[PDB]
Amino acid sequence: QSLRPLVLTHGSLEFSFLVPTSLHFQAAQLKDSFLATLPQPTEELAQDDEPSSVVELVARYIAFVAHEVDEGDEDAH
Amino acid sequence: QSLRPLVLTHGSLEFSFLVPTSLHFQAAQLKDSFLATLPQPTEELAQDDEPSSVVELVARYIAFVAHEVDEGDEDAH
């Protein structure tokens, strides 16, 4: 009924996600502008104060989204 | 019940949109092929006979869509 594959892709680390069919472009949007917040990927497997693990890709995204909740973006709360 | 964030993004000018949940991929499609109609963005804030304001991003899109209405694209009228 409602399953939508969302991938958090970067350099050499990825995280897969399951999303409601409905809320799949809100989650696409936060992912999209978030993969620009990060600096050009490094195949040397790390950057200073950028992602270091897959645990950091999700953590960075959790605060990214949670910031846009408290940010004054209306009609989309 | 029915709200869907559509963004018209380009260079340094954007326009946000509210769309019915239903009619959100028809509006995604017209937006998508329309952001290819435009030439590579200019951070110098203008191109000759390309977008100059945010009033032009929507105007260019209004005629883009209204052209595909009168264009012979059936089942999608």
Side-chain angles (χ1 to χ4, degrees):
Chain A
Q1 253 203 357
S2 205
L3 281 189
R4 290 212 156 188
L6 254 185
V7 210
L8 263 193
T9 30
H10 176 65
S12 29
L13 21 68
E14 293 187 26
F15 188 64
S16 292
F17 214 84
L18 260 185
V19 170
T21 283
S22 38
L23 313 156
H24 177 75
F25 194 69
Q26 186 59 69
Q29 267 310 113
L30 320 173
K31 159 199 168 172
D32 297 341
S33 44
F34 173 69
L35 313 183
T37 307
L38 314 152
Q40 305 142 13
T42 299
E43 309 298 6
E44 315 178 345
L45 306 183
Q47 271 307 343
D48 193 2
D49 281 346
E50 304 313 321
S52 262
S53 200
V54 169
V55 196
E56 299 198 20
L57 297 170
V58 180
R60 279 189 140 79
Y61 185 96
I62 298 182
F64 179 76
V65 165
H67 159 78
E68 259 92 337
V69 173
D70 299 352
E71 191 152 25
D73 302 317
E74 302 210 355
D75 280 359
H77 182 265
Chain B
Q1 253 203 354
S2 205
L3 280 189
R4 289 212 158 187
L6 253 185
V7 211
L8 264 193
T9 29
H10 176 65
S12 28
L13 20 68
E14 292 186 27
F15 188 63
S16 291
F17 215 83
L18 261 186
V19 169
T21 285
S22 37
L23 311 157
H24 176 75
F25 192 69
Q26 186 59 68
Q29 266 309 114
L30 320 172
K31 160 198 168 172
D32 296 340
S33 46
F34 173 68
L35 314 184
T37 306
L38 314 153
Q40 306 142 12
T42 299
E43 309 297 6
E44 313 177 346
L45 304 184
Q47 271 307 341
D48 192 2
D49 281 346
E50 306 311 322
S52 260
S53 199
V54 169
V55 195
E56 299 197 21
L57 298 169
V58 180
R60 279 190 140 77
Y61 185 95
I62 297 181
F64 178 76
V65 165
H67 158 79
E68 259 94 336
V69 172
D70 301 352
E71 191 152 24
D73 302 319
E74 303 209 355
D75 280 0
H77 182 266

